[PDB]
Ligand binder design. Structure first.
Ligand SMILES: NC(=O)c1ccc[n+]([C@@H]2O[C@H](COP(=O)([O-])OP(=O)(O)OC[C@H]3O[C@@H](n4cnc5c(N)ncnc54)[C@H](O)[C@@H]3O)[C@@H](O)[C@H]2O)c1
Ligand SMILES: NC(=O)c1ccc[n+]([C@@H]2O[C@H](COP(=O)([O-])OP(=O)(O)OC[C@H]3O[C@@H](n4cnc5c(N)ncnc54)[C@H](O)[C@@H]3O)[C@@H](O)[C@H]2O)c1
Ligand SMILES: OCc1cccc(F)c1F
Ligand SMILES: OCc1cccc(F)c1F
Ligand SMILES: [Zn+2]
Ligand SMILES: [Zn+2]
Ligand SMILES: [Zn+2]
Ligand SMILES: [Zn+2]
Lengths: 374, 374
């Protein structure tokens, strides 16, 4: 019925920075070769989507944002072989083309087809599938999940278990997997280690879950909002510290708590100063610090390279280092098997139509993750 | 007939920054408990010693510098068990106490008893065994090898093979091991990888030897001094590039040459700008960059953290990541077994009395390593 035809549906369009989303009718073109059109079932509100609104994460406007979602394939373009109409799917903000140097590397996951490094806001072919008020609307990271229907390149979608609860697993599309993988895959947290986690929102909580899963003996939560501490301890933090409580810089406090520095630190906020703090708080000879949070556009940090010379390792990762198309289905399967929990991350649920209230809850600090249902 | 007595001998004293060494008589006190007095046989001139003269590496003056050396034990203090008079030894600028948390960690080597982080310029007990002109002289990194005799703490000395050529193996005390281990132990260069080495002095050449030994398929030497290329190729470099030959920044050149970034980059110069450049030239998703060069005191670098978020790993190390007391005798054994070569690194061999000439060779770029003999 809708196959091969333009679909008119509602989407949350962001016409300008620092403005509310405008929920309105958009036209969604049918999928071209190697593209997939998806009816969205649920989508998470991630801090990154808000950074697009704030303008600290830069991507071309106007745009349909949203990148953490789950849905059902409405139709496929010519040539698609990995999903079919009716399949449950999670769109991948980091693609997996499977052919580039990175996809073929055993460790890398930042596929060269990503739209993150030099964002164009289009499909892989350099055009848009979205029209609103007669004007072309940009995509975001090849996903654009703030729409009843979106179109994504095949390399940016993964087929998941047919029995998956889409209102929970959308988190595997961003927040959960990013935090969990930062701990278990990127940092490679070891059994008996001490970890510090800067930022106790959805992603930071996921890092704590990964730290616990890996067998960390101590997991120190760091956040300026003490209301986050309860849930952090629930998912595995052994102690929580608020830097505003201390007269000395937090890296000194943590170094003292850990009796000379932590084995593993994680910056999960997106501030330049906390990236440097987190690197400093790891043990100077063998510590590892992982940058997860997204820094403000085009800003450089300043640091003393002697921090590195002594032995520290500093690294960052997108999407927890997971090769996206390979891992998402495996992660969903693991979820179905009760290997990890997602409920602790979801604090609010709202209809898609209340997306602006959802962003208000994030901005206010009230929610961890709000899931929007279509 | 010197054991237990003060020794009057010649040393090269640095009384002031930016001045020649003064070759003169000093008094060397006998070793106290757990100390070892060494008659120096050979000592290398390392860029780091020149950084002490330059004032860019800060340590209390006046000082007897020198940290890359080999000699023979003259006498030992009470309680020493790992060396005995007549033993061939290499002083270790990074000690191995074997009891601290770093020493007990499987990866770390920056022992907490080091005099590098916050230099005191003394023995472990906070005193000096050197007197010159009635004035106390500081030690340098617990070693001070620019003297016919020095006294070092037991944790800062390693017994080596009785048949070692001391005029060669002194390089295992700093230069060779630092470069070699940075490749094979810190970066863990993999077979068939592409490596880039910034700085083709003695340490950079040892990095190249390590990269070659690790099975790298391409090893790109980077230096502004084209005179270094020939030797770099002899020890394993496949290509050499001079940044001054190009109109575009060298990270762009290296990224193009390596079809998207190198696997492993090494900064072996000590410049803030080349540290960032070396990081940038490694592949954005899986590249690893190792800082080896010692940067100028108290200077911060500026960098865009997106370089790390995409997947890059940045680390540094002291002494090639080798746990010093454990590795040095093994490295010497390996040298005696012809597993690596040291002759390529030695370009000049001078009597100790010509130390200042030796330093002039380094500053002018004429030498790679000059070895001073006593
Ligand atoms: N690397 C990736 O692939 C990836 C994926 C998803 C999200 N992110 C990024 O991760 C970061 C965290 O996302 P999130 O959804 O958990 O965000 P969030 O806003 O829900 O959580 C951030 C937390 O940091 C805390 N915080 C703020 N300032 C702080 C300070 N000075 N010290 C300590 N804590 C402080 C806040 O109180 C909050 O609890 C964001 O920057 C987001 O863009 C990265
Ligand atoms: N991490 C450690 O344990 C350790 C140990 C020994 C030495 N070091 C440091 O390693 C560094 C190198 O030591 P070395 O003994 O090889 O010194 P060196 O002076 O022998 O070598 C420096 C090389 O860098 C090159 N160079 C200078 N400026 C450059 C530029 N802008 N671009 C490219 N190349 C440039 C020079 O031409 C020279 O060949 C020094 O900073 C030294 O202090 C560190
Ligand atoms: O939250 C998704 C995300 C992860 C990393 C970098 C981004 F820009 C981004 F939008
Ligand atoms: O060359 C020896 C050395 C290595 C690393 C750091 C230093 F300060 C230093 F002097
Ligand atoms: Zn790819
Ligand atoms: Zn996200
Ligand atoms: Zn130690
Ligand atoms: Zn040295």
């Amino acid at each position: 019925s809708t196959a091969g035809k333009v679909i008119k549906c509602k989407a949350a369009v962001l016409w300008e920075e620092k403005k509310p989303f405008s929920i309105e009718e958009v036209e969604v073109a049918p999928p071209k070769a190697h593209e997939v059109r998806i009816k969205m079932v649920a989508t998470g509100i991630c801090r990154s989507d808000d950074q697009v609104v704030s303008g600290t994460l830069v991507t071309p406007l106007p745009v349909i944002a949203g990148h953490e979602a789950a849905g059902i394939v409405e139709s496929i373009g010519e040539g698609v072989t990995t999903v079919r109409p009716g399949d449950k799917v999670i769109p991948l903000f980091t693609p997996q083309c499977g052919k580039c140097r990175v996809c073929k590397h055993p460790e890398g996951n930042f596929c060269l087809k990503n739209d993150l490094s030099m964002p164009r806001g289009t499909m892989q072919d350099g055009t848009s599938r979205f029209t609103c008020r007669g004007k072309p609307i940009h995509h975001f990271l090849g996903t654009s999940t703030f729409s009843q229907y979106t179109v994504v390149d095949e390399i940016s979608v993964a087929k998941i278990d047919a029995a998956s609860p889409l209102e929970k697993v959308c988190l595997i599309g961003c927040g959960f997997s990013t935090g969990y993988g930062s701990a278990v895959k990127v940092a490679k947290v070891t059994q008996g280690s001490t970890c510090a986690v800067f930022g106790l929102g959805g992603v930071g909580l996921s890092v704590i879950m990964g730290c616990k899963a890996a067998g960390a003996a101590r997991i120190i939560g760091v956040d300026i909002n003490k209301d986050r501490f309860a849930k952090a301890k629930e998912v595995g933090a052994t102690e929580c510290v608020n830097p505003q409580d201390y007269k000395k810089p937090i890296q000194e406090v943590l170094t003292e708590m850990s009796n000379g520095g932590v084995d593993f630190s994680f910056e999960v906020i997106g501030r330049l100063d906390t990236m440097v703090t987190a690197l400093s708080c790891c043990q100077e000879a063998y510590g590892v610090s992982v940058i997860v949070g997204v820094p403000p556009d085009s800003q450089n940090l300043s640091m003393n390279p002697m921090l590195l010379l002594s032995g520290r390792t500093w690294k960052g990762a997108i999407f927890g280092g997971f090769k996206s198309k390979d891992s998402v289905p495996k992660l969903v399967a693991d979820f179905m098997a009760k290997k990890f929990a997602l409920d602790p991350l979801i604090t609010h649920v709202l209809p898609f139509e209340k997306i602006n209230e959802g962003f208000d809850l994030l901005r206010s600090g009230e929610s961890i993750r709000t899931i929007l249902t279509f």
